[PDB]
Amino acid sequence: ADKHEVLLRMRAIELLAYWEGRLVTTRLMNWFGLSRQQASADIKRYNTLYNPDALIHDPSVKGYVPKASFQPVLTTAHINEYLNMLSGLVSESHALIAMPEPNLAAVQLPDRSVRPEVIREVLRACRNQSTLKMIYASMQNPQWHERIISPHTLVYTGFRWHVRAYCHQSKQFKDFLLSRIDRTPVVVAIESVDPAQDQQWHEEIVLTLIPNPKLNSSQQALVEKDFGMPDGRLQIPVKKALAHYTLQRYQTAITLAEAEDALKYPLVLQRSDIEKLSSYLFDQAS
Amino acid sequence: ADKHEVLLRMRAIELLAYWEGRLVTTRLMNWFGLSRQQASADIKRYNTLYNPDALIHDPSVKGYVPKASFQPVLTTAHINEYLNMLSGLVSESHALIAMPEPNLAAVQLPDRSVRPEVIREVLRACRNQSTLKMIYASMQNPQWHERIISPHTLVYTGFRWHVRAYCHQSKQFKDFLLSRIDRTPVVVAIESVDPAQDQQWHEEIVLTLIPNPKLNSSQQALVEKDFGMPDGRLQIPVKKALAHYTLQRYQTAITLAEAEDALKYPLVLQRSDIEKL
DNA sequence: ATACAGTAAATTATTTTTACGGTAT
DNA sequence: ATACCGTAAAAATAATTTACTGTAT
Ligand SMILES: [Cl-]
Ligand SMILES: [Cl-]
């Protein structure tokens, strides 16, 4: 029942203990502008209400250390949680290389191309299940032209932002890149579409990612370890309309021609799945 | 002079106004566990102490909306700022697809390979400028073997974690994948090497990214708009030891053979720089 | 009718300030 | 003597509770 701010301090305690091996009040002080006394109380609150006696004061290292059986209770055990805490405390989302703390660098992709006036209109249309008229341009049709769309979900792929939307002139659900929308979209009064009919969005498929069959056995074991594969594969369930983005996010080879460079593409989509993958040209708006 | 908690609430007010066009106390209440009265007090504090009169209550849309003259004062106009705020409230870093709120999906890459005990030791060695003995394996030598390293920086490329470190067996600074480090790294008493000698780390270069020249003029203008090019190019200054990771992060073609697929690679490293890498 | 809106006064809870401690090393 | 630690008691600040409000659609 704790407020978000206290929760952030509990998370910070847990992540510092778990990932750095050491926790001192001063770090929480530097992060939250707190007194040593309240930070001490935060540590005690953690150690009694969240992770009972999970931390122990070790005067040898002049700070708190996790107990041998320490197991996080507010975060999952992967390192994204640690980076997320650090970057939320010292954000530099505009920079190419974030340096949230000393000795940590994180490659970023600053997006300055998505305009707020486009976002407010499109997100509101998403929430209202409303229909927009907008000016758009695609690779297939690169001069500005009108589109009539009923959007339902904004999507960040890890590289680009688009909105999943019903295209009324083609009568299909497609992806529209938000950076390609000129001016501000305007609401139009036409019968709206039910997003439940977006087959590709609601149907799932399982992609099987495997080590590049061109690598020798010791090399494939390294790929398995790199991606945490349980049994020589990554089975990835994903919405059909998001499969390609997921594959791109993993840097997977999806054509037999790509997989021939096992150095560039140690991770490959298993061949039987390739003929399953929908056409990518019809993902993008026409 | 405002507390960190208050600053986060001010940030949330600004970002909701700027990116959603509308702000109501109820959202702040759901986000921070506040009473409507305190959230109302936060809105007034923003509108008077941070961005004077930038917001106005519009009863027609049942909330506060930014004024036509609205200008953010606590955030940059990068949509990353909005997504980071949203995701900071609902931590689902484990999911393939995060849904920090309804009508928003975010493709993620959950990392399952980087171990905490490896991080504690290596981070401590970075801060102490100390020297570690560890068990490693690479694609070139995929049998497990010992390596002696002086690390200085952990690196997240957007796809993988590695540590930049002086490699004592090859007397070069190299990148070590953290997923290949066995959980038992050891501090050893060997002179550590000065990270100031990491030539690749401290030298910068300027990469020039351009629309794929195979695209026609109208398509190239779209690439320019997509990537925010001021004058038909993206000039990216970066540490040499991070250049390749940056190019991968942008999904840019870096070989003339890759640049032949203008659909897969609308963005390419300019030819003169390709021979530099 | 709904879902938004203002706030002051009183009560309550959160942090801060102050002081006087203990343990490696 | 550094560098970390506990934490009560008093004081200061922030937040909640209560109780009255108003408006476009
Ligand atoms: Cl650094
Ligand atoms: Cl971009």
Residues, CB within 5 angstroms of ligand 2 (ion)? A 111
Contact B157, B109 (CB under 8 A): no
| H/E stretch holding B55 | strand B55-58
Buried b (16+ CB within 10 A) or exposed e, B119-136: bbbbbbbbeeebbbebeb
Shortest CA gap B194–chain A (Å): 14
Contact residues, chain B, for A137 at CB < 8 Å: 218, 222
CB within 8 Å: A155 and B216: no
Contact B236, B210 (CB under 8 A): no
- With H, G, I as helix, E, B as strand and everything else as coil, classify residue B237: strand
> What resolution in angstroms does the PDB record give?
2.3
Chain D: nucleotides below 7 Å from protein CB are: 3-9, 14-19, 22-25
Q: What's the rounded Cα separation, in Å, for the pair A72 and A50?
A: 9
| H/E stretch holding B205 | strand B204-211
Contact A208, A270 (CB under 8 A): yes
Contact B52, B125 (CB under 8 A): no
Is the dihedral angle over the CA atoms B240, A88, B110, B98 positive or is it negative? negative
Is the dihedral angle over the CA atoms B187, B117, B239, B274 positive or is it negative? positive
Judged by phi (left if over 0) then psi (alpha if -120 to 50, else beta), residue A247 lies in: alpha
Measure CA to C1' and name the residue nearest C14. A38
Please choose, from the candidates A171, A49, A20, the residue with its C-alpha nearest in 3D space to the C-alpha of residue A12: A20
Measure CA to C1' and name the residue nearest C18. A37
Residue A227's closest chain B neighbor by CA?
B113
The fold of B116-196 is SH3 type barrels. (2.30.30)
Q: DSSP class of residue B138?
A: -
| CATH classification (class only), A116-195 | mainly beta
Contact A139, A159 (CB under 8 A): no
Please tell me whether any atom of strand C lies within 7 Å of the Cβ of B57: yes
The residues near A10 (Cβ < 8 Å, ≥ 6 apart) are A2, A42, A45, A46, A50, A74
Q: DSSP class of residue B86?
A: H
Contact B68, B80 (CB under 8 A): no
In residues, how long is chain A? 286
The residues near A147 (Cβ < 8 Å, ≥ 6 apart) are A133, A134, A135, A136, A167, A169, A176, A285
Q: Interhelix angle for A36-45 vs A25-32, to 10°?
A: 110
CB within 8 Å: A113 and B226: yes
Please choose, from the candidates A121, A184, A110, A98, the residue with its C-alpha nearest in 3D space to the C-alpha of residue B76: A110
Chain C: nucleotides below 7 Å from protein CB are: 2-9, 15-19, 22-25
Backbone angles phi, psi at A18, to 5 degrees: -65, -45
Q: What's the rounded Cα separation, in Å, for the pair A210 and A200?
A: 24
Place of tokens 């955030």: B75
CB within 8 Å: A225 and B21: no
- Residue B105 (CA) to nucleotide C3 (C1'), in angstroms, measures 27
Which CATH number describes the domain made up of A4-77? 1.10.10.10
Environment class of residue B157 by beta-carbon count within 10 Å: exposed (0-12), middle (13-18) or buried (19+)?
A: middle
Contact A214, B99 (CB under 8 A): no
Q: What's the rounded Cα separation, in Å, for the pair B211 and B253?
A: 10
DSSP of chain A? ---HHHHHHHHHHHHIIIIIS-B-HHHHHHHH---HHHHHHHHHHIIIIISTT-EEEETTTTEEEE-TT---SSS-SSTHHHHHHHHHHS--TTSSEE-SSTTEEEE------S-HHHHHHHHHHHHHT-EEEEEE--SSS-S-EEEEEEEEEEEE-SS-EEEEEEETTTTEEEEEEGGG-EEEEEEE-SPPPPGGG-HHHH-EEEEEEEE-TTS-HHHHHHHHHHHT-SSS-EEEEEEGGGHHHHHHHHT-B-STTGGG-TTT-SEEE-HHHHTTSPPSTTTB--
Q: What's the rounded Cα separation, in Å, for the pair A258 and A268?
A: 9
The experimental method is: X-ray
Q: What's the rounded Cα separation, in Å, for the pair A203 and B75?
A: 38
Please tell me whether any atom of strand C lies within 7 Å of the Cβ of A1: no
Structure tokens at B100: 């920090």
Contact residues, chain B, for A221 at CB < 8 Å: 142
CA torsion B251-B255-B259-B265 (nearest 10°) is -10
Neighbours of B65 (CB within 10 A): 18
What residue spans define the domains of chain A?
A: 4-77, 116-195, 203-274
Structure tokens at B61: 């849309």
